[PDB]
Design a protein around this ligand. Structure first.
Ligand SMILES: O=C(O)Cc1cccc(O)c1
Length: 318
């Protein structure tokens, strides 16, 4: 028998716990004949703040985490390419691209970990208390939260006043008036009542959404290596590209009931197209160039990685 401590930051009802890690842990339990017992500790119930999850799992404080790579800026630099404006397709396609990326050119970012899967959410949307965002001009004077440095840089480039924080902090920041809105996918909003604190929502039309941010589903490497071969087989049956694809599918589905809750809460939904959308995509091109420059300075082939991300997403967007 083997107990594995799972740690993450969203509360237990959030989809990442209730509809991803919980059923994952049930599959692992059953397929190991009852021997691998994953204990789920949501809401940072084992101590620390969300950026510390990667340290905890790297160093063996806990055995498994689910987290957002960019909550620790610069720590997973290859994955930043997938955060660039108008990079993502569905979460299903983009998650498969992310996992193949990590399996190949981006492997050094995660060499200190056992990768269960790297995946992402459906492209995020723009949420504000009251102001409809119909063009970049509407972001002027709006204090807008993003989840990572790359996404706050996007918000800067679109004309907003950028603020960063992990998602559990967003509701309190809205309540106190220190932000006017945020970017998130739909699916995370009900877990923090974010759809009751914002009434205006903007999405984008076409084949690529505004942005996504990579999630990390990681196991302590030493702990994985210490497992018996039969236990490793169970974990690996529940890992890799097939898991990244499954996670992406699930995250695409998670948007649907959450969007409905936002509409039932009185929200507007505006879809950018035409000129207003093209203006944002043009700003996105400049932000790609900014990122390539930052990647080059850090010893990465920024241009190669951006093209790789695009080509992998195209590969799986079928
Ligand atoms: O902080 C974020 O915006 C990223 C995030 C965090 C948790 C669930 C999500 O869908 C997305």
């Amino acid at each position: 028998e083997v107990v594995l401590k799972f740690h993450s930051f969203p509360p237990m009802p959030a989809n990442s716990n209730a509809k991803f890690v919980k059923p994952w842990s049930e599959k692992v339990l059953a397929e190991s004949n009852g021997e691998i017992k994953v204990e789920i500790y949501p809401a940072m119930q084992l101590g620390g703040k969300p950026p510390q999850l990667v340290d905890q799992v790297r160093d063996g404080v806990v055995d498994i985490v689910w987290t957002v790579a960019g909550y620790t800026p610069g720590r997973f630099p290859h994955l930043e390419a997938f955060e660039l404006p108008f990079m993502p397709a569905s979460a299903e396609a983009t998650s498969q691209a992310l996992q193949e990326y990590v399996d190949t050119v981006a492997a050094s970012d995660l060499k200190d970990y056992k990768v269960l899967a790297v995946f992402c959410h459906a492209p995020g949307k723009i949420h504000t208390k009251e102001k409809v965002i119909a063009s970049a001009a509407d972001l002027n004077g709006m204090k807008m939260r993003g989840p990572t440095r790359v996404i706050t840089k996007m918000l800067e480039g679109l004309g907003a006043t950028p603020v960063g924080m992990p998602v559990p902090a967003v509701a309190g920041a809205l309540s106190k008036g220190v932000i006017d809105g945020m970017v998130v996918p739909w699916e995370i909003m009900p877990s923090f009542k974010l759809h009751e604190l914002t009434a205006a929502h903007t999405t984008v039309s076409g084949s690529r959404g505004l942005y996504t941010t990579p999630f990390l589903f990681l196991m302590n490497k030493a702990k994985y290596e210490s497992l018996s071969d039969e236990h490793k087989k169970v974990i690996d049956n529940n890992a890799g590209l097939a898991l990244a694809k499954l996670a992406g599918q699930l995250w695409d589905g998670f948007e649907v009931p959450a969007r409905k809750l936002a509409l039932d809460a009185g929200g507007t939904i505006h879809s950018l197209s035409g000129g207003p959308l093209a203006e944002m995509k043009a700003a996105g091109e400049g932000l790609e160039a900014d990122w390539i420059k930052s990647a080059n300075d850090r010893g990465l082939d920024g241009a190669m990685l951006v093209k790789t991300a695009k080509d992998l997403i195209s590969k799986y967007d079928k």
